[PDB]
Amino acid sequence: KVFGRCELAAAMKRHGLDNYRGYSLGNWVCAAKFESNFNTQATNRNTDGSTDYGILQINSRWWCNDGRTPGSRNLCNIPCSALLSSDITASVNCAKKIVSDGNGMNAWVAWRNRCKGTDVQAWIRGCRL
Structure with missing residues (x-):
C-alpha cells in the first residue's frame, strides 16, 4: 500500500508514534x-x-527474520514480510523498539541525513489530526 502523506500521519498517530521517545x-x-x-x-x-x-525500512540483520540473513537477530520477533503489510501495526511496533535502542531516530539513515534539523512539522501541516 502507498499511503498518502496525511493518511500515514493519521495512521502513525493512532498507533502512538506522535512524540514517542520524544519524536x-x-x-x-x-x-x-x-x-x-x-x-x-x-x-x-x-x-x-x-x-x-517496509515504510520505515527495518533491517533483517537485527529486527526481523527473512530467512536469508546469516547470523542475524529477530529482535522484533516477526517475519520481515509482516513489515510489508497494508496494516502498519508491525512496522510501528518494531520501530518503537528500535527508537528505544539508544541512538534514537539516528538508527534511520534517511532521517539523520534528510529530516534531522529540518522543519519536519511541514510533513503534517494541512493534515486533519
Missing part, C-alpha cells in the same frame, strides 16, 4: 517519506547481505 509526528512522516516514499511494500538490499523492509 514529534513530523519526524516519523519525514522518515517514512525518504525511506520508502510511503510504500509499505518497499524492499532494498544492503551490501552486507541484509535487506530493509
Whole structure:
C-alpha cells in the first residue's frame, strides 16, 4: 500500500508514534517519506547481505527474520514480510523498539541525513489530526 502523506500521519498517530521517545509526528512522516516514499511494500538490499523492509525500512540483520540473513537477530520477533503489510501495526511496533535502542531516530539513515534539523512539522501541516 502507498499511503498518502496525511493518511500515514493519521495512521502513525493512532498507533502512538506522535512524540514517542520524544519524536514529534513530523519526524516519523519525514522518515517514512525518504525511506520508502510511503510504500509499505518497499524492499532494498544492503551490501552486507541484509535487506530493509517496509515504510520505515527495518533491517533483517537485527529486527526481523527473512530467512536469508546469516547470523542475524529477530529482535522484533516477526517475519520481515509482516513489515510489508497494508496494516502498519508491525512496522510501528518494531520501530518503537528500535527508537528505544539508544541512538534514537539516528538508527534511520534517511532521517539523520534528510529530516534531522529540518522543519519536519511541514510533513503534517494541512493534515486533519
